[PDB]
Amino acid sequence: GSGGSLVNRKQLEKMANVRFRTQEDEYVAILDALEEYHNMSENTVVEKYLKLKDINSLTDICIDTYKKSGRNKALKKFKEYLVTEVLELKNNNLTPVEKNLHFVWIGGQINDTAINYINQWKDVNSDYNVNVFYDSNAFLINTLKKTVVESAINDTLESFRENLNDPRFDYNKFFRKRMEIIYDKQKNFINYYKAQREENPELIIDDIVKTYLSNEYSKEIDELNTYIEESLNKITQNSGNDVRNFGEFKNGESFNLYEQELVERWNLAAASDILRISALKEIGGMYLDVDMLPGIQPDLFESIEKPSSVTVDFWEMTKLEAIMKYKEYIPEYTSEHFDMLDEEVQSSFESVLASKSDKSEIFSSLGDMEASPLEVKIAFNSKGIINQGLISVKDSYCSNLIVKQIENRYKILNNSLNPAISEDNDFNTTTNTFIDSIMAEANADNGRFMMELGKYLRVGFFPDVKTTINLSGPEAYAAAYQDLLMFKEGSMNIHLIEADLRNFEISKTNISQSTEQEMASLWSFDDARAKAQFEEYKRNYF
Amino acid sequence: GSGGSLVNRKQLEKMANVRFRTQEDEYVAILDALEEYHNMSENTVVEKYLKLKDINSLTDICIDTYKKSGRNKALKKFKEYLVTEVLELKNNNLTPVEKNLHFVWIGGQINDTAINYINQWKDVNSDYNVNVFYDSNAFLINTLKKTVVESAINDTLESFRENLNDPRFDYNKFFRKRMEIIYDKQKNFINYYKAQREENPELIIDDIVKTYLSNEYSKEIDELNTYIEESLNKITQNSGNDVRNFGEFKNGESFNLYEQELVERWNLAAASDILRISALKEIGGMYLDVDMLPGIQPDLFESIEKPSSVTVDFWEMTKLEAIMKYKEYIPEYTSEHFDMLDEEVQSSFESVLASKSDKSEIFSSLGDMEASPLEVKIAFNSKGIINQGLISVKDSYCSNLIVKQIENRYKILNNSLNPAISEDNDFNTTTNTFIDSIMAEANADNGRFMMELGKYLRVGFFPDVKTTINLSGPEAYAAAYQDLLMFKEGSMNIHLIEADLRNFEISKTNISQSTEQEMASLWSFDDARAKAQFEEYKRNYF
Amino acid sequence: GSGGSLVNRKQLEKMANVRFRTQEDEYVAILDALEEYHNMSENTVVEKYLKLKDINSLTDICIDTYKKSGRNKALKKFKEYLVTEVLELKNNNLTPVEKNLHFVWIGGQINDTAINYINQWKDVNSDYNVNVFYDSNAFLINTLKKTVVESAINDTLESFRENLNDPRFDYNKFFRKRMEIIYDKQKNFINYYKAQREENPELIIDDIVKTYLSNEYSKEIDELNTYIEESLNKITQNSGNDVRNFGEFKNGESFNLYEQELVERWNLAAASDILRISALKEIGGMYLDVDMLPGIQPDLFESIEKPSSVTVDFWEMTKLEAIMKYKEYIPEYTSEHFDMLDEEVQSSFESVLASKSDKSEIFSSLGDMEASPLEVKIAFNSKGIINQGLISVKDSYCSNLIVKQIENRYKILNNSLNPAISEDNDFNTTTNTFIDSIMAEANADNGRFMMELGKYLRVGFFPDVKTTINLSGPEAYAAAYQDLLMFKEGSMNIHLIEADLRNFEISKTNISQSTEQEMASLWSFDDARAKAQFEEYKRNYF
Ligand SMILES: O=c1ccn([C@@H]2O[C@H](COP(=O)(O)OP(=O)(O)O)[C@@H](O)[C@H]2O)c(=O)[nH]1
Ligand SMILES: O=c1ccn([C@@H]2O[C@H](COP(=O)(O)OP(=O)(O)O)[C@@H](O)[C@H]2O)c(=O)[nH]1
Ligand SMILES: O=c1ccn([C@@H]2O[C@H](COP(=O)(O)OP(=O)(O)O)[C@@H](O)[C@H]2O)c(=O)[nH]1
Ligand SMILES: [Mn+2]
Ligand SMILES: [Mn+2]
Ligand SMILES: [Mn+2]
C-alpha cells in the first residue's frame, strides 16, 4: 500500500489554509475524500483511480463555487498532483498480461505475405496463443468493393472521352464524378441488403453479396463459392478465430458499428480498428497489424555503426532486409535498400548475420509482460501514435474508455448522418446536408474533430481523408488518455502533447515497425499521387 | 411471467410500419430492445423498469433523429404504453413491507402530547417495531432558536418605540428588521460553531450550544444539563432510536444537509423531512408525522349519517373528538367541535361509541402491508400530497429517487448560496446576492422551483415561505414520481396532474389525518396572521 | 564544299527506279532540285537548309500525289537522309558566337544574391560583354502584384472565419475565391491603365502604378520614388542594359506580348522568357537565368570519388557548396548538404579545394564559342530541356523559329482570350468562356497544347499550371526544333524524343546548374505544398 506523491489531508490543509478564514461545506469535501483515499491500501488500483476521479471533480467544484477564494491557486496545483498520482498508480502497480497475440483480417481471403509475417511471431513466441481473427459471413466484402469501384472508374472515364483534353476535367473532377456513381452503387446494394435481411433474417452477408454480383455485375456464383472455400481453409489452417464465435462482441453495442463499416461502407480498415480494441477489452493481450514484424535483438547488430548520409529509419529498414536476404525466411522480401549500400558493409552484415544458427538469436521474444489495468500501451511511428501495436490487460480501464470513445464518435456521426442518408438524394446533396447538420451541432470543443467527420462519405474514394483516424483510429486512443488524465469521459478535442502520450508507449524494442508492407501501407493518398493515378486510368482505356 | 399491456416487437412493427420504407439502425434499436424486455420473466421488477427506461430513451431518439418520419405519431403513442406498463408493473408485482413504524422528533425535548399520539399506534400495532428517532447531539437546537428569535424581537420592538404610531413601521418592516438581527445572531453562532469544531473535533453540537448560551445570552449550563438528561430519559423510555447509531445515514451524502438545516438554520421541520425518507430507503416501513393518529374502522360509525350544513372534514375531525371524550385515551383532547353539535346526535355517538369494549374495536390496525419496490406511497391532504404518511419497501426505486431529488435541490441551493454567505455582509445584501445568482442559473424548467428557493434565508422568520416544501418536502416527492413516469432523473418542474399522483396514494383508511395537533400545525403563516402577532408583540413590551 | 551523306540525283534515281515505269512531272521535281542542292558549295548553310526544306516538301507531294507508287517506301527513306543532312549541316559548318552574356531582371529591384551570381560569371569571363537587362518603365510591377495578392489573401481569409472548421472550405476553395478577387483587382488596374495611357500617351508604366497604389492601396508615392531611384542606381552600376534602348525589340511584334505578361498579368517569368530569345536573335550570345553559376573545372575534383548512398545531383550540389564555405565568394551560401557529409571527406575537400590560389583554377571560362547559324543550344535539367541556358549565334534560323513559335502561340491565346475578357464578367464566367472557345478551335494536333493554354488566367495564383511553359517556355523551343527537323513551321504538338533534342544540348560542363537559388526556384507549386500554405495563411490572421 504505497502512499505515493499525493499529499495527505493535513498537507493539503497546509497548502491552502489562508489566514483568518473558516472551511466551507464544499472545501472539507475534498479533505474528507482525500483522507479516505489514503486508507485504501487493500483496494484495487482501478478503485483508487475512481476515488481520484471524484477528488479531482470535488476540487474543481470548490474552485468554481468561489472564484475569489485565494485557495484556488493552491488547489489548481493540487490538481497537478492527482495526475502524477494517476501516473504513479499506473507505473508502480502492474499486472501480468494475458499471452495472446491478436491479428485481424476480414473482408476477403487472407494474403500469404500477411501469413508469413504472422508466422514469424508465432515461431519465436511458442507460449503465446495466437488468434488471427476472420469473418465467415464476410469473405466477399472486398471483392464487392473491387467490382464496384472498378466498374465506377470505367463508367467515369467514358463520360469524359469527348472532353479528354479539356482542362476542366482534372483529377479532382474525376474522383468527384466517380464518387457520385460509387455512392449510388453502394447505396443500391444497401437497400437490397436491408430488404433481403428484413425478408429472411437467416441470410448471411456473403449470400446477399454473391447474389448481388450475379444479378448486376454478371458474376458466376460457383467461382465465388470456391473462393470462400479456399479462404476458409486457408484461415482455419492458420489459427483462425471467427468473430461470430466471439459473441461477446456481437452482443455489445460496438457491433452495429463493425457491420456499418464492413457491409455499408466496405471500410475494412475501420472495422479492424474497432475489433482490435474490443478484442483487447474482453480477451487481453497484444494486438498487431499484420504488416508488423517482431523486434530485432538489441545485441545482434550493436557492433556495426550507422552511415552519416542515410537516415535512421533507413537503417532500421535495412536491418530487416538483411535478415531476409541470407536467412531467407520470407519469399523475395525486397532487397532494395540493402543493394543501395557499400559492399564493404554489406559483407559486414553477411558475415556477422550468418554467424548465428537459428531464429531465436535474431528476433527477441515477448515472454512475460506486465502492464497496469489502467493503461493500454500504443505504438509510435514518426508522426504520433498509431494503433498497429496495442498491449493491454484484460478489461483495462483505458481499454474500456477507448471503446466508449469510439462508440460515442459513431453516435455523433450517425445522429447527423442517418437523417440525411434516409431521405435518399444525389451524393452531393446528401453530403451538403450531412455536413450542414454537423456544423450546427458543433461547439468549440468538437470543432477540430467535426471537420474531419464531415468527409466520412469520401473515405476510401478521395485524397486527404483522415475521418477514419478520428473515428476508430489514433485520435480516439488519444482522447481516452485525455479522459484518463483529465478525470473525465467523452473528451473529443485533444490537448495532450507528445510528451504526455509517451506515458503509454509500447517499448520500441518489442515491435519492428519498419517493415516492407508498412512502407506499402504508408503510401499515403496524397493529392499529387491521385493525379498520376488519373493519368494512369486515362492511359488504360486508350 | 405476465406480459402486460406493453406491445410485442411484431405488434409495434405493425403500429408503425409505413409502406415502402426500410428500418433504420436507430429504429431497430427499439425493436431489438423491446423483444428483450418480454423475455425477462425471471428478472426483478426493478430490472424490468430499467429496461423500459432504456426503451423509452431509445424511442425518443428515433423520433428526434428523424422528425419527418411518419412513424413518430405511432412512436409518440408507444411512449404512453410504457408509462402504463410501468404502472402495471407497480400494481401487479407487490412485495411485503417491513413492519416498522417510524417517528421523528429532534431539536428539543419530546412533548408528551406527541408521545400520547405515538402510543395509540404502538398499542393497536403490537407486531410493528416502532422507532421514534431522536438526536443526542442536538437537544438544544430548539432552545437556541427560542433564545435568539425572542431576543431579536425584544431588540426590534425597542428600535421602534419612538416611531410606534408612524405607519411606515408596519408588520412588514418589523419582520424585515427582526430577520436582519436574527441572521446576524444566527451567523455569529455558526462562525463560533465552525471554529470550535475546527479546534476540537471531539465536541458535539450541544456542548457548543450550551457554551454559546452561557457566554452571550446569560444561561446557567447546569439547568440545560438537567434538560438534556430529562429529555434523554424521556425518549429512551419511549422506543428512542438515535440517529448517531444510524451511521448508514451519516456516511451518506444527505447527512451534510441534515446538519445544515439542524445546526446552521435551526429548521427542525426540514431536517425531519430529510431523515424520514432516508430512513425508509435503508430500513423500510411507514413513516408518520407525530401529529398523526391511526385509522378509524370503516364499520364503527357506518350507521350514523352526516349533517348537511357542516363540511366533511369537520365530520372526520369530530369522529376523533368523540373517541377522546368518552373512552378518554388522551388528556383533554379538545372537545370543541363535538360541543358544536346537536345533543340528539351527541347521544347517538355516546351510545354507539360506548357500545365497544377495548381499543381494537375502535382503530383499524395495519398488519400485513404490500407495496411495489418501485413505489413510495404518500398521503393526500385537501391541498395536494403531503409527506406526513409515507409507506415504502426497503430500498425502493422511488425511495432512492426522492433522496437523489433532495440531494440535487440542496446542491443547486448551496452552489448559489454558499458563495454569497461566505463573503459576509448584511442580511439584505446577502439575500440580494443569493437571489441574483439564482436567477442567472435559472432556465425555463427550474424557474417555478427557483422562485421559492430564493426565500431560503427567510424560512421560519417570515410569512408565505414555501421554500422548505420545494427542498425536502412534497415537491421533491412529486418530482421523483415524474422522474419515474418520464423515465428520467432530476426533473425539477412538475407537470403531473393530481390524478397521476393518486397512483401513489396511501389508502385513506390507514391514516386518520384530521387530528387536533394537525389543525394546530396547519395554522399556516398567512400575511394577516403575522400582523396580529406584531400587534401582540407590540402589546407585550407596553 | 562538303557533299555530306545526302545522296546525289543518280543515287536517288537508283534508290527508287522501279522497272518499266517512266518519271512523272512531279517525281523529276525532286531530282532537278536535289541536283541543284549539291551545286551550292559557295552558298550559305542557311540557304542550303531552305533548299532541303523545299526538297523535303517536294518529296512528300510526290508520295501524296501517287499513293500507289512503289517508289514511296524509298522516298519515305529519302526523307530520313534529309534530316540527317540537316544535322550534318548543323554540326559541320560552325560560326563564332558573339561574346555576350545576357541576364534579365524586370518588375522590381534587382536582388543582391542575383548580382553575386552574375559577378561570378563577370569575373572569370573578362572578354565577354555582359548585359543585365532591366526596364526603367517597370520597377513597380512586382510591388503592384505583392500589394494585390496579399490584399486578396486578407479579404479571402475573413470571408471564411465563420466557416473555418467547415471541411468544404479547403485549400482548393480558398485559392478559387482568392483568384476571383485577384482577377477583379488585376482587371480594375488594367481598365485604369488602358484609360490613363489612352488619355496621356506620354505616361510610363510606373507613373500609372504608383498613382494606382496611392489612391486605392494607400501608399505614399515618395517611398516608391526612393525605391525606383535605389533600383536604377543598383542596376546602372551593375552593367544595366535598358529594354527601352533596345528599340529593335519594341518595334518587333513580340513586344505587345512582353508588355501583356508584364503589365496585364504581372508574370515577370513570362516576360523574361520572351525577352531572352528575342535578345539572342538580334544580339547573339549566351542567355542565362540569374540563378545559374559558371562551370566547375573537369580536373578540379577528379581525384575524389562519389558516395554510394547519396545521389549524383546531391554530389554536384555540394561541389558548389564546398567552394562557398572556404573560398567564401558569396555571403552565407547555405552549407546545408556539405554538413550532411562524412568529416573525413569534408577534410578531403577542405584540403584539395584550398590547394588552389585564385578563381581561375576553380571555374572554367567560356572563351571562344562555336555554334551553327541553324541552331540554338539549350540546357537540360533532369526533367527535360530548360531555357535557363541558351547559346545562340546572331540571327540564327532556330532563334527566329523560336520567336515565331512564341508569337503564334500568343496569337492563338489572344484570339480566343481577348473576345472573352472584353465583355467583362466574373472571373469564373470569363474562364468558362475562354476555355469553351479554345476547345472549339482545337484540333488533334494542338490538343495537348490547348489543354494547358486554358489555365492561362490561373498562372501564378494556382497549383499545377504549366501554361507559361507552353507559351514562352521550353515547349516552344521544342516546337522550333520540330519545325527545323520536320522542315515545317508552326508545329504545336511535339513528337520529338529526348534523344532527338540532345542534338541541341549546351555541353554540361559550361553551366553549373545545381545552384542554391535553382533549388529555391525548383520548389514546384505542388497541390500539397499549396495546402500547407493555406494552413499557414490561416494561422496568420488568427
Ligand atoms: O482487406 C483487408 C486489409 C486490411 N485489413 C486490416 O487493416 C489494417 C491496416 O493495415 P495497413 O498496414 O494496410 O494500414 P496502416 O495502418 O499500416 O496504414 C490491417 O492490420 C488489417 O487488420 C483488413 O481487415 N482487411
Ligand atoms: O421541534 C420539532 C417539531 C417538529 N419536528 C418534526 O416536524 C414534523 C412536522 O410536524 P408538524 O405537524 O408540526 O408540521 P406540518 O408538516 O404538519 O406543518 C414532525 O412530525 C416532526 O418529525 C421536529 O423534528 N422537531
Ligand atoms: O522578379 C523577377 C524574378 C524572376 N525574373 C526572371 O525569371 C527568371 C526565372 O528564374 P527562376 O530560377 O526564378 O525560375 P525557374 O528556375 O523556376 O525557371 C529569372 O532568370 C529572371 O530572368 C524576373 O524577371 N523578375
Ligand atoms: Mn501498414
Ligand atoms: Mn402537522
Ligand atoms: Mn531557377
C162, C154, C101, C153: which is closest to C294 by C-alpha? C101
- E strand or H helix that includes residue B220: none
Question: Which whole-number Å values give the CA distances from B328 to B238, B332, B511, B519, in the listed order?
Answer: 21, 8, 20, 20
Q: Give CA–CA dist B347/A4, Å, rounded.
A: 83
Q: Give CA–CA dist B40/B93, Å, rounded.
A: 14
User: Chains that contact B by 3+ CB pairs under 8 Å?
Assistant: A
C304, C274, C345: which is closest to C104 by C-alpha? C274
Q: Is the CB of A291 under 6 A from ligand 1?
A: yes
Q: Give CA–CA dist C475/C378, Å, rounded.
A: 12
Probe ligand 3: pick from C142, C262, C263, C272, max atoms within 8 Å of CB? Answer: C272
Site of grid cell 426483478:
B44
Q: Give CA–CA dist A457/A186, Å, rounded.
A: 11
Which residues 388-417 on chain B approach chain A with CB closer than 8 angstroms?
Answer: 414-415
Q: Give CA–CA dist B533/B526, Å, rounded.
A: 11
Question: Which whole-number Å values give the CA distances from C417 to C94, C182, C228, C413, in the listed order?
Answer: 42, 18, 33, 6
Please name the fold of domain B96-292+364-406+512-542. Spore Coat Polysaccharide Biosynthesis Protein SpsA; Chain A (3.90.550)
Handedness of CA B225, B227, B230, B231 (dihedral sign): negative
Give Dmax over CA atoms of chain B in angstroms.
Answer: 89
Q: Grid coordinates standing for A128?
A: 503465446
DSSP, res B219 = -
Atom of ligand 2 nearest to the CA of B522: 18
Nearest Cβ partner of C527 from A168, A439, A527?
A: A527
- Quick check: A417 and A436 in contact, CB under 8 A? no
Q: Grid coordinates standing for B310?
A: 357542516
Amino acid at B122: K
Architecture in CATH for domain B296-361: Orthogonal Bundle (1.10)
SS3 state at C382:
coil
Q: Grid coordinates standing for C204?
A: 510610363
- The Å distance, Cα A290 to ligand 1 centre, comes to 7
Q: Is the CB of C275 under 6 A from ligand 3?
A: no
- β-partners of residue A384 are A381
Q: Give CA–CA dist A238/A116, Å, rounded.
A: 10
B12, B3, B4: which is closest to B31 by C-alpha? B12
C52 CB-contact burial (10 Å; exposed 0-12 / middle 13-18 / buried 19+):
buried
Amino acid at A389: G
**C-beta neighbour count of B95 within 10 angstroms:** 16
Q: Count CA atoms within 13 Å of residue C271 on its CB side.
A: 26
Q: Grid coordinates standing for C113?
A: 544574391
Site of grid cell 370543541:
B336
Length of chain B: 542
C17, C29, C38: which is closest to C58 by C-alpha? C29
Length of chain A: 542
Q: Grid coordinates standing for B297?
A: 374502522
Q: Please write down the HEC assignment for all residues of C218-278.
A: CCCHHHHHHHHHHHHHHHHHCCEEECCCCHHHHHCCHHHHHHHHHHHCCCHHHHHHHHHHH
Alpha helix positions (H), B354-443: 397-422, 427-440
Q: Which CATH number fits domain C295-361: 3.40.50.2000, 3.40.190.10, 1.20.58.480, 1.10.10.1780?
A: 1.10.10.1780
DSSP of B313-379, one letter per residue? HHHHHHHHHHHHHHT--STT---TTTSSS-HHHHHHHHHHHTT--SGGGTBPP--S-EE-TT-EEEE
Question: Which whole-number Å values give the CA distances from C163 to A448, C151, C154, C171, C174, in the listed order?
Answer: 12, 20, 15, 13, 12
Å from B66 to nearest chain A CA?
A: 6
Q: Give CA–CA dist A465/B77, Å, rounded.
A: 43
SS3 state at A382:
coil
Strands A293-294 and A95-96, how do they pair?
unpaired
The separation between CA A33 and the C-alpha centre of its own chain, rounded to angstroms, equals 37
SS3 state at C378:
strand
Q: Give CA–CA dist C476/C404, Å, rounded.
A: 9
Q: Is the CB of C272 under 6 A from ligand 3?
A: yes
Q: Give CA–CA dist B408/B402, Å, rounded.
A: 10
DSSP, res A62 = H
**C-beta neighbour count of A263 within 10 angstroms:** 21
Q: Give CA–CA dist A4/B81, Å, rounded.
A: 55
SS3 state at B523:
coil
- Quick check: B340 and B274 in contact, CB under 8 A? no
Length of chain C: 542
Alpha helix positions (H), C45-106: 45-65, 72-92
- Which ligand sits closest to the CA of A108? 1
Alpha helix positions (H), C283-426: 312-326, 343-353, 397-422
Amino acid at C160: F
- Quick check: A525 and A465 in contact, CB under 8 A? yes
**C-beta neighbour count of C245 within 10 angstroms:** 11
Note whether C439 contacts A: Cβ–Cβ < 8 A: yes
Please name the fold of domain A9-93. Methane Monooxygenase Hydroxylase; Chain G, domain 1 (1.20.58)
SS3 state at A356:
coil
DSSP of A96-131, one letter per residue? EPP--EEEE--SSPPPHHHHHHHHHHHHH-SSS--E
Q: Give CA–CA dist B460/B479, Å, rounded.
A: 24
Å from B520 to nearest chain A CA?
A: 35
Q: Grid coordinates standing for C207?
A: 507613373
Is A198–B23 a contact, with Cβ atoms under 8 angstroms apart?
A: yes
Is A166–C439 a contact, with Cβ atoms under 8 angstroms apart?
A: yes
Question: Which whole-number Å values give the CA distances from C410 to A115, A165, A437, C105, C481, in the listed order?
Answer: 60, 19, 49, 22, 19
Question: Which whole-number Å values give the CA distances from A211 to A36, A144, A217, A263, C372, in the listed order?
Answer: 64, 11, 10, 15, 72
For residue B3, report the phi and psi dihedrals to the nearest 5 degrees: -75, -35
Site of grid cell 485524397:
A463
Chains C and A touch (3+ CB pairs under 8 A): yes
Amino acid at B118: I
The separation between CA C36 and the C-alpha centre of its own chain, rounded to angstroms, equals 38
Q: Give CA–CA dist A493/A491, Å, rounded.
A: 6
**C-beta neighbour count of A105 within 10 angstroms:** 23
Q: Give CA–CA dist B459/B260, Å, rounded.
A: 13
Whole-number CA gyration radius for chain B:
27
Q: Give CA–CA dist C184/A234, Å, rounded.
A: 65
- Quick check: A438 and A416 in contact, CB under 8 A? yes
Strands C376-380 and A101-104, how do they pair?
unpaired
Question: Which whole-number Å values give the CA distances from C528 to A171, A336, A527, in the listed order?
Answer: 14, 27, 6
Q: Give CA–CA dist B37/B1, Å, rounded.
A: 11
- E strand or H helix that includes residue C453: helix C447-453
- Quick check: B480 and B406 in contact, CB under 8 A? no
SS3 state at B40:
coil
Is C448–A309 a contact, with Cβ atoms under 8 angstroms apart?
A: no
Amino acid at A284: G
Q: Is the CB of B107 under 6 A from ligand 2?
A: yes
* Terminal alpha carbon distance of chain A: 75
Residues 6+ apart with CB under 8 A from A342: A307, C308, C309
Site of grid cell 474500456:
A400
- Quick check: A222 and A228 in contact, CB under 8 A? no
Residues 6+ apart with CB under 8 A from C109: C139, C227, C230, C231, C234
Q: Is the CB of B104 under 6 A from ligand 2?
A: yes
Q: Give CA–CA dist B223/B214, Å, rounded.
A: 11
Handedness of CA C527, C532, C535, C540 (dihedral sign): negative
Chains C and B touch (3+ CB pairs under 8 A): no
A222, A250, A157, A50: which is closest to A534 by C-alpha? A157
Q: Grid coordinates standing for A288?
A: 498487431
Which candidate in B418, B423, B434 is best for mutational testing of the A interface (most A CBs within 10 A)? Answer: B418
- Quick check: C412 and C257 in contact, CB under 8 A? no
Q: Is the CB of A114 under 6 A from ligand 1?
A: no
Q: Give CA–CA dist A471/A170, Å, rounded.
A: 30
Q: Give CA–CA dist B331/B119, Å, rounded.
A: 13
SS3 state at A296:
strand
DSSP of C472-535, one letter per residue? TSHHHHHHHHHHHHTT-S---S----HHHHGGGBPPTTTEE---HHHHHHT----HHHHHHHHH
DSSP of B158-214, one letter per residue? HHHGGGTT-TTS-HHHHHHHHHHHHHHHHHHHHHHHHHHHHH-TT--HHHHHHHHHH
Amino acid at B168: R
Domain residue ranges in chain A:
9-93, 296-361
DSSP, res A493 = S
B454 CB-contact burial (10 Å; exposed 0-12 / middle 13-18 / buried 19+):
buried
Q: Give CA–CA dist A487/A87, Å, rounded.
A: 12
A319, A288, A306: which is closest to A515 by C-alpha? A319
Residues 6+ apart with CB under 8 A from C418: none
String of b and e for C323-346 (b: at least 16 CB within 10 Å)?
bbbeeebbeebeeebbeebeeeeb
Q: Give CA–CA dist A287/C266, Å, rounded.
A: 58
Site of grid cell 553551366:
C511
Ranges of beta strands (E only) in A289-392 are 293-294, 370-371, 376-381, 384-392
Question: Which whole-number Å values give the CA distances from A506 to A475, A510, A518, C371, in the listed order?
Answer: 17, 7, 18, 67
C463, C444, C440: which is closest to A172 by C-alpha? C463
CB pairs under 8 A between A and B: 44
Residues 6+ apart with CB under 8 A from C507: none
Atom of ligand 3 nearest to the CA of C106: 24
Å from A177 to nearest chain C CA?
A: 17
SS3 state at C143:
helix
Is A439–C165 a contact, with Cβ atoms under 8 angstroms apart?
A: yes
Q: Count CA atoms within 13 Å of residue A97 on its CB side.
A: 28
